[PDB]
Design a protein around this ligand. Sequence first.
Ligand SMILES: CC(C)CCC[C@@H](C)[C@H]1CC[C@H]2[C@@H]3[C@H](O)C=C4C[C@@H](O)CC[C@]4(C)[C@H]3CC[C@]12C
Ligand SMILES: *[C@@H]1O[C@H](CO)[C@@H](O[C@@H]2O[C@H](CO)[C@@H](O)[C@H](O)[C@H]2NC(C)=O)[C@H](O)[C@H]1NC(C)=O
Ligand SMILES: CCCCCn1cc(-c2cc(=O)c3c(O)cc(O)cc3o2)c2ccccc21
Ligand SMILES: [Ca+2]
Ligand SMILES: [Ca+2]
Ligand SMILES: [Zn+2]
Length: 775
Amino acid sequence: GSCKGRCFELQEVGPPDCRCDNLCKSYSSCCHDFDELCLKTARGWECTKDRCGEVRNEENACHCSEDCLSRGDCCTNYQVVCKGESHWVDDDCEEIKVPECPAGFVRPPLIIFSVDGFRASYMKKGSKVMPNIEKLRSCGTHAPYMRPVYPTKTFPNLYTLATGLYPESHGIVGNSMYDPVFDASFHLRGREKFNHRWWGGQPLWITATKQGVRAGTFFWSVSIPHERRILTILQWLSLPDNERPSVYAFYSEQPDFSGHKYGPFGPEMTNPLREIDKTVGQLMDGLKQLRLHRCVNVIFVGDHGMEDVTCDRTEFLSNYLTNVDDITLVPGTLGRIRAKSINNSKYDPKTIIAALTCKKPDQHFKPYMKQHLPKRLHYANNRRIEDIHLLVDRRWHVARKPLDCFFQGDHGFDNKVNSMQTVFVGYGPTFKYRTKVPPFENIELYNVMCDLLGLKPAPNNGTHGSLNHLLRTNTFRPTMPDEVSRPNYPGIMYLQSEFDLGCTCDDKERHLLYGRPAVLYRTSYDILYHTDFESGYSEIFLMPLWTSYTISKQAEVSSIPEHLTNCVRPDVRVSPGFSQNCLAYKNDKQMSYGFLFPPYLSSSPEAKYDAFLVTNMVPMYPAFKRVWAYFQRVLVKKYASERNGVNVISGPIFDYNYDGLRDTEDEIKQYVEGSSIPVPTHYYSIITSCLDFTQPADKCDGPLSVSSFILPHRPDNDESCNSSEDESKWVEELMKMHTARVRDIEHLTGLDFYRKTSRSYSEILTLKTYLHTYE
Ligand SMILES: CC(C)CCC[C@@H](C)[C@H]1CC[C@H]2[C@@H]3[C@H](O)C=C4C[C@@H](O)CC[C@]4(C)[C@H]3CC[C@]12C
Ligand SMILES: *[C@@H]1O[C@H](CO)[C@@H](O[C@@H]2O[C@H](CO)[C@@H](O)[C@H](O)[C@H]2NC(C)=O)[C@H](O)[C@H]1NC(C)=O
Ligand SMILES: CCCCCn1cc(-c2cc(=O)c3c(O)cc(O)cc3o2)c2ccccc21
Ligand SMILES: [Ca+2]
Ligand SMILES: [Ca+2]
Ligand SMILES: [Zn+2]
């Protein structure tokens, strides 16, 4: 019934003994004396010279008594003021080669310092307003920025951070959520968020406790001031080895709060950024007091950035739809449209998005069926994610009615938007000294954090080892996956006369730079060699899985000879039974065909004939052919001209269940008419070259540069409002919106790339997780 000596305990209490927890206020279960005993504030949070040696007065917020550090409740500045010790920030950075921890510490403790809406750019704008944060960044390990997940909202990103899962896998797909199985709605305000049914995956505090590592409460009630959070964590860290947690978490509502009201770049942002730094100096001044400042690994990390957004730049559905009253919309920086199923006869998904498509000359949102959203967002495979999505342009909002400024800043946009980028910093013995690392995605932190705790990570969407360059120790050693299916290498097995495919034609080492892609599923494929390209032909999918070729910088482009314009030749190396039939494409009136290796980049007039081989043909819609033709005839040579050659790996992807995973033969829903030939949901291409552009791609002795895409194989070009103009106007913009990581293609193909490079597997992993933003 009382909180005496019970304040901020870690005791797991189901009913009934009343509560003194860090979250007792959010639950309303605080024992009554929590405010007086636990939420002390008297005499502030910093020692003054007059308070030094003071007799202990329990009522003071913190203590400057000589018994204070025996009790572990000194103000964080006790030794600075009282014992004449230097502020951590004023001390010069010294490398922490080994963790200098008290005896009995089994693990280097870990502290996660989370900050809401910390734009990556704030770091510069504040080298002098954030002296403590800047010493952690300069002397520890830091990235220029960290990519948040989409939606770039607080809960999806904080839980992604806790799980290493995309929102669609852990289920916090948004700050607000309807779940049809539950018939219930989740909101940032309410007690529904406290129900465990919403929270999938395995968050870091569960991974640790299940493995015998104790955790402090990652969640703080807002009524608990930040200073008191720093004192509690510093107090948990003084507990005996039995009770002492290994991992801790501090959260700041700032600067998201001020970035919302005043905007991201207001001069008013400064003092928020300074308040945060003082809370860092309190933690590091606190840690140094405990002589834990060279023992604890500290992570400074945000959830998302802040963008200039005002209620003035708001598109209203009522201007595009007829029955805005028969729809539910999750509004703002992203759109989700569901049917108000009651009074909802007229609601038809197809009519809705047609009415929202390219209706205004400068439409600041695009409709999207979730499945057609860019694959790099991985935002479709959850029942809480509505089919209809509105991808809103940065700096804009979407709302139902004009009747829905108080805010100059907001966020939630696409996660490639630079204003949505956030910060990561690592400081401590397991982290690297004075070291910098490339921007990485926040789905990879979970593995690093398990590593820093010696925890076996739960299955997640990070690529374990992609971030080993962050750490001096706690090494996780990645191993290349093993080839499941092995390639058959066919020869001239059959005769041109044995083929009755209805295919007609007026016939008459350099390309596999980084080794053969591994096929990591059970199938039957043939490596096919040609002058200009190499391919792995799926006898199951009657198409190549991968097609690899190299186009040098000086390469010439050539037109399709008009006598071969509709030429499809039969490959003697592969069975009539394991080949497509041109007849199918004739019958299929909406389906046409394309080629993985472009005939435009043939090396000779004679070589070009290979490009017309039936084993290089794939189902392509006439609308997509516009996109692919442009990429093949124009952009490859352009990339080669810019990057001093490029190796290219193109192919099909099948993901009708939009799970981001290779489709099985049964998962395929669309085939060519009367054919066993599958229609891909997307086409991919991996474009690689030497990061050192003075070295051609084929003679590259160092790091690699890649850009990749997963272009959607759509029967129309309605995604492109400028599709009517020349492809010079729209194609590349489309391909930029569907930038992809090689990793993302590996999942969608079951293929493993870069297995035969000169680089370490760690580097290559880092390379497969890279996403070319074009921002
Ligand atoms: C009102 C705000 C100040 C706080 C909101 C807190 C809420 C999001 C947090 C508080 C307790 C959290 C759960 C707790 O850690 C136990 C686990 C079990 C694990 O398997 C999945 C996650 C889960 C349920 C946490 C979910 C988030 C919770 C409810
Ligand atoms: C993100 O991680 C989850 C966790 O593994 C992946 O979902 C699992 O995938 C495996 C492999 O196919 C299945 O055996 C599991 O059944 C899946 N999860 C569950 C709960 O069943 C998910 O595929 C990953 N996402 C991506 C895009 O790779
Ligand atoms: C290794 C994992 C690191 C992530 C830590 N992490 C902190 C959360 C947090 C804590 C609060 O105290 C809080 C608040 O006081 C007000 C508010 O609006 C939101 C708030 O969220 C949070 C939530 C969901 C998943 C993860 C989380
Ligand atoms: Ca990954
Ligand atoms: Ca799939
Ligand atoms: Zn947030």
